[PDB]
């Protein structure tokens, strides 16, 4: 399952980067070019969403009242619910990832030994498992990169 592997990596690295504030220097490995452009696209638009919706995000983080790194059950139900209307687009996808990073940041403050892993896995699981065929049709992360490609 390469789609899942690649997705978990891009999403995990971004969240970890956001939480620790430190970039990771490791070869992405497989389809590395796409993954890096994805991470780059993800930095640009991802940070933008958090900046531009700081007020809404702060409120959402507050109602989520996430207790620990493992308490991702509620967020999982939230994300599933977001797509429950049958609408699928990159805007929603990147917004969920951006909020994921926003949550990952808050987790650090309360304890610094928090793997962002459980959070990244919860997000990746929803996207790749419930939107499997939609992603494949979009050429996966190249579609992501392409959609958010600005001139």
């Amino acid at each position: 399952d390469e789609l899942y592997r690649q997705s978990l990596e891009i999403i995990s690295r971004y969240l970890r980067e956001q939480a620790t504030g430190a970039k990771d220097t490791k070869p992405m490995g497989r389809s590395g070019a796409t993954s890096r452009k994805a991470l780059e696209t993800l930095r640009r638009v991802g940070d933008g969403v958090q900046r531009n919706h700081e007020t809404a995000f702060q409120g959402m983080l507050r109602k989520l009242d996430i207790k620990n790194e493992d308490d991702v059950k509620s967020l999982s139900r939230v994300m599933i619910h977001v797509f429950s209307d049958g609408v699928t687009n990159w805007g929603r996808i990147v917004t969920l990832i951006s909020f994921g990073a926003f949550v990952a940041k808050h987790l650090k403050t309360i304890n610094q030994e928090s793997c962002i892993e459980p959070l990244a896995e919860s997000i990746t699981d929803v996207l790749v498992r419930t939107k499997r065929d939609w992603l494949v049709k979009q050429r996966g992360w190249d579609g992501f990169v392409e959609f958010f490609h600005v001139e």
Binding site: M60, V78, V82, V87, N89
Partner: peptide, 22 residues
Amino acid sequence: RPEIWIAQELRRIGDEENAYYR
């Protein structure tokens, strides 16, 4: 109820972001 509100925000923001880049 809180989770429904959270879903509403993410969806509103998601579609708004989608339109912008679209």
